[PDB]
Nucleic acid binder design. Structure first.
Lengths: 73, 75, 74
DNA sequence: CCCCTCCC
């Protein structure tokens, strides 16, 4: 059972965002295709050190994506 | 034919660095993406009004980057 | 009227052209470094390639001086 | 205008 598409957000220290994205964005593109989740990384907010990541998919896809995001860091 | 990855440095007056970087760094992000060069702007340094920019890529990337840098300041 | 930071610039040259920069017994390049005051290093050609990288280190003036002298060599 | 493996 897939269940519904849901959206989850988390923040990431901006210092660490390059690890999830990777040179030429390869690593995030890989995370999106492997997990099947939509993954958005916002620009860092106004004078702040947090960057919001939005993950959208079934619960499994989102749990898949959270692991792949962890393994990146 | 891309050729070797090389590094060039130039300086800018520190009072011009804002035009290049942009609010929340958006302009410089755009310049890196578009030229495909790595572009690093150093902090202040200590005492002086010059700020070093390091550009790394193929010769075309670096030339592409130098135009986009100039386009940021001029306009 | 103000020298500024020592900075580094690289440019490539066709390998077939490097003899002109160097001179017999490395004398033209020696002359280029003393003249401009820039430090100038020419790498060995990278594998499978026609290009040699030249690294010039100095202030902006020294580097521009060196870039002219390199050009006048060719 | 202050970013920084920078993707969409």
């Amino acid at each position: 059972a897939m269940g519904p598409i849901i959206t989850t957000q988390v923040t990431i220290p901006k210092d660490l965002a390059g690890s999830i994205i990777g040179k030429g964005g390869q690593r995030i593109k890989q995370i999106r295709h492997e997990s099947g989740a939509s993954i958005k990384i916002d620009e860092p907010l106004e004078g702040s050190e947090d960057r919001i990541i939005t993950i959208t998919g079934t619960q499994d896809q989102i749990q898949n994506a959270q692991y792949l995001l962890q393994n990146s860091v």
